[PDB]
Write a protein that binds this ligand. Sequence first.
Ligand SMILES: NC(=O)c1ccc(N[C@@H]2CC[C@@H](O)C2)nc1
Ligand SMILES: NC(=O)c1ccc(N[C@@H]2CC[C@@H](O)C2)nc1
Lengths: 237, 237
Amino acid sequence: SHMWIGVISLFPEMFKAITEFGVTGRAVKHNLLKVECWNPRDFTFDKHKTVDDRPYGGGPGMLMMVQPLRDAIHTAKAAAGEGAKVIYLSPQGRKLDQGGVTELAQNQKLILVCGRYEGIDERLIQTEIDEEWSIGDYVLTGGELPAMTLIDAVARFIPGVLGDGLLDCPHYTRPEVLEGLTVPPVLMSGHHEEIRKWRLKQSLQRTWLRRPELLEGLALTDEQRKLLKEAQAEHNS
Amino acid sequence: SHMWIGVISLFPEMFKAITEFGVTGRAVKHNLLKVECWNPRDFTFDKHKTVDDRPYGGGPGMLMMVQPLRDAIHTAKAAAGEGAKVIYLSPQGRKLDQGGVTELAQNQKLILVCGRYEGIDERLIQTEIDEEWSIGDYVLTGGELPAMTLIDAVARFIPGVLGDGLLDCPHYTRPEVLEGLTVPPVLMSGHHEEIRKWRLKQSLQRTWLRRPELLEGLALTDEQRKLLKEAQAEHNS
Ligand SMILES: NC(=O)c1ccc(N[C@@H]2CC[C@@H](O)C2)nc1
Ligand SMILES: NC(=O)c1ccc(N[C@@H]2CC[C@@H](O)C2)nc1
């Protein structure tokens, strides 16, 4: 169940960060993930290969020039064939979370449009973009890091790439004692069921202490209710 | 007011995506931003340069091996001198938003620790990390894209790098008509005050329609209350 992702970007070499390294690098090498980039600069026709343009109404910044960006998008859509969802990365988009990742990962083909300067023409969003997505409520210099973030997150759902609403539990490895801090004995016990429950209780405790709002969205199992109650009682000494 | 950012990563070449391209690339070239990387693999001593290790208690994955990671961190801290805040990137961290970016941007020195595999030993978080930060509620294969995201966001606050709680307004550039869609006449008017108010009204409308929770956190000006009321009346026809 491989995934094809088309990318529109003025800086396609940025995507080497995911295509050449680590788990995602391996996914690309093994043809589980295909990332293909089109650069608006290649679709310019003037001598200086101009990719920006002035905003109507004035303002300090520039926008992506429409014609090169539009042509790049059309070319990516033709390469993708039917069924590709076109996504624009911006702070105005739907905020990404793990549920959203799982939704996006159901697509066999995505096209990711990465804006630079002050963004892109609103009418291109109307005519060319299927969905707007944000990776978080903060502003970046370009849509490339958000696109790579999205790619990395969905790649984890592709079969062969890798080897429940709660924060992760603490993890420990060698040595047994590190600056006076010992590994919790239960993890040394070999008692698989005790270890499972300890890890689950830790996740529940950490979620409650750090991100209590996340618990509101969950229908806890009987076991989770019990372990959370235990953690909260211990916290209250 | 330049910024120095130390990075601990098994894949330092990923950071070329921000140090070699665009606005952040220029910031690095102009010495406004300095990014310096240490690779735990360089601090290994065994023949096969091992950087992972088995989790106590079992489990499917691996963790970062403590000794090479710890030594890399210590080396970065020595290079940084006094006053560097050490940050670990993880989904268990404080969720990044623009207010958090502005807070982080007050630091002259940061050290960013990027985890791989299933993460790092909890005792290293206790002994070496000042703050844990997340870029959003989703899981990635590594902390590098979150680190670069953080770097990009804070870099925007460094003087010379670039040329209020609401979503951005729509932007338009040439041509005047695009697939039948016209530029809003106010933007062609040259009336700077009318354009300002239109843009502000659009931001208020878009925030209300897409992210109404964001408005709850704001103390709107009299002007903003008026324009939002107008937008909501127009929406209700
Ligand atoms: N939070 C995000 O997902 C995000 C996306 C894009 C972005 N910056 C680009 C620059 C110009 C405009 O296209 C938007 N910043 C943040
Ligand atoms: N949302 C985030 O900021 C984020 C940070 C890290 C991450 N993955 C790394 C891999 C191993 C562990 O160190 C964490 N995923 C997501």
